[PDB]
Structure 1
Amino acid sequence: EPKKYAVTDDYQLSKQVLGLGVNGKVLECFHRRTGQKCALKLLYDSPKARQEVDHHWQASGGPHIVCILDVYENMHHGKRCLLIIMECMEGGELFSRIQEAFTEREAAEIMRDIGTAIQFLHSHNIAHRDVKPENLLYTSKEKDAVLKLTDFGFAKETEKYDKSCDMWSLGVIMYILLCGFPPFYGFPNPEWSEVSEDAKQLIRLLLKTDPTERLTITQFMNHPWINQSMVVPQTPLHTARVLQEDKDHWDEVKEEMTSALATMRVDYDQ
């Protein structure tokens, strides 16, 4: 099912880059028959790159996951390559949309969306292991846009530990959603003043230092704040203001979280 004829027979490539995904750069392209703009991820062929395509195909179809359209096995400047054609997510990154009222109920909606995605993967015994702001994208800039998760370059077919790393990521994203800075912890006033006890409780249960004590996705999804996301108070939050105000170290917090996820993927630590 990976197509072996040239990707450029089906797609018109452009020289616009969306971003760097560890294995490969991401480029815009256009399907030739339809007009649709799509995203193309170039991976040099390796066991790891083959695992990514495998894990992404398996995940593709689930809720709130960026869909694969085609996969090509091509030669490119004398090197063997896998090209993942994905749907183009032109809404941009989760937290960029947010810094562009933002209530606690809206945050619950978002975390529920991300949770459904992780529920799908985990029930299919796939741990993502790289859930972080720049891997959470919107399909469009419109109001009806759908939040989706990409980047299976660190995904692993499962175990309880690898899954618990995803649940830690949910806690960190939820924390930043609720106030605008990461837990690098406590809940400092005045940002955490009118945030509900259920929100803080859920985050405590996810940010547990001991992975065994950490909530499972199925417990995450059954928590009132997620399960009853539609009756969470419409309480206005500081996040949008805080993000714009602290825009000059957003690259730092992204770098810090990438670093934290990296150390959780190590065989031995301390």
Structure 2
Amino acid sequence: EPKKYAVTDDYQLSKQVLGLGVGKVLECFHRRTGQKCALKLLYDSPKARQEVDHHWQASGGPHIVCILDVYENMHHGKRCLLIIMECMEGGELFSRIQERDQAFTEREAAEIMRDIGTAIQFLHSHNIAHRDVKPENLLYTSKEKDAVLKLTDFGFAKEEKYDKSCDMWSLGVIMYILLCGFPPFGFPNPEWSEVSEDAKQLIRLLLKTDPTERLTITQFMNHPWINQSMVVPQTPLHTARVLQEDKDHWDEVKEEMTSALATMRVDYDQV
């Protein structure tokens, strides 16, 4: 499966960065095709081998960034693994919402959450917990209206009912920000004034402090706000405007969510 000849035989590399994982992400081009792709460089290790394994197994599933190829090469005198993936040129979910003016509606947020749920559903049914679902890892395939949302980065993935409930918590957090533009770290007025009863009820079941009480993915996907996302109200949301206004605090919000997820993966935690 993993190619053992030089990646640069098949791809022309850039110095240009597209992202940063727990391996950094480079733009590259396929030599035979010209196609723009993305390269993640991982230094070989148990953790790197597991990321490769889990992403490969997930690759091809609904709303997951596809792996095109894996190389095992020498670089700077070290063994490394290069993951080639489709180029997610639309970038980050919430950066795309921010750039809309254009009405962003509750029905639209419901389709995005359903998109993410279908990814989690696929993962959980193959007994993979992702464990780091967050803004940096939710990407669009292109900049056009028909771009597809996909999940990436299997660096914290694990193949526990507990581990799976950390993905469910992520889903609640992502849904919360999507409907209002700010994180849960109450449904305050006026941002939340006109939001679905159904949407607020689903968030509460996801953000349950007790992990054993959180909704499962099967239960998420069966919720009317997900299952019947196409008949959710088209009510104009504050999200894009708030994201725009709060843009100077966005890095802080990401850091907090990252910190929160890492806390959830510790073997032993404070009370």
TM-score range (shorter-chain normalised) is over 0.9
State the alpha-carbon separation in 1 of the partners of residues 60 and 84 from structure 2: 14
| TM-score (ref. length: structure 2) | 0.98
State the alpha-carbon separation in 2 of the partners of residues 97 and 19 from structure 1: 16
Secondary structure of residue in 2 paired with 1:15: strand
Deviation, structure 1 residue 72: 0.2
Deviation, structure 1 residue 19: 1.6
Deviation, structure 1 residue 145: 0.1
Secondary structure of residue in 2 paired with 1:212: helix
1:35-64 Cα shifts (integer Å, max 9, x gaps): 110000000000000000000000001000
1:99-143 Cα shifts (integer Å, max 9, x gaps): 100000000000000000000000000000000011000000000
1:70-115 Cα shifts (integer Å, max 9, x gaps): 0000000100000000000000100000010000000000000000
State the alpha-carbon separation in 1 of the partners of residues 219 and 152 from structure 2: 23
Secondary structure of residue in 2 paired with 1:242: helix
State the alpha-carbon separation in 2 of the partners of residues 77 and 203 from structure 1: 47
Deviation, structure 1 residue 153: 0.2
Partner of 2:195: 195
Task: Name segments (4+ residues, structure 1) moved above 6 Å.
Answer: none
Deviation, structure 1 residue 178: 0.2
Secondary structure of residue in 2 paired with 1:165: helix
Secondary structure of residue in 2 paired with 1:137: strand
Partner of 2:91: 92
Give structure 1 stretches of 5+ with no counterpart.
Answer: none
Deviation, structure 1 residue 20: 1.2
Give the paired residue count.
267
Deviation, structure 1 residue 198: 0.2
State the alpha-carbon separation in 1 of the partners of residues 204 and 20 from structure 2: 32
Secondary structure of residue in 2 paired with 1:127: coil
State the alpha-carbon separation in 2 of the partners of residues 112 and 136 from structure 1: 13
State the alpha-carbon separation in 1 of the partners of residues 196 and 20 from structure 2: 37
Give structure 2 stretches of 5+ with no counterpart.
Answer: none
From 98, 108, 111, the counterpart of 1:109:
111
State the alpha-carbon separation in 1 of the partners of residues 224 and 113 from structure 2: 12
State the alpha-carbon separation in 1 of the partners of residues 222 and 62 from structure 2: 17
Secondary structure of residue in 2 paired with 1:62: coil
Deviation, structure 1 residue 229: 0.1
Secondary structure of residue in 2 paired with 1:203: helix
Secondary structure of residue in 1 paired with 2:212: coil
- The reply to whether residue 204 of structure 1 matches residue 212 of structure 2 is no
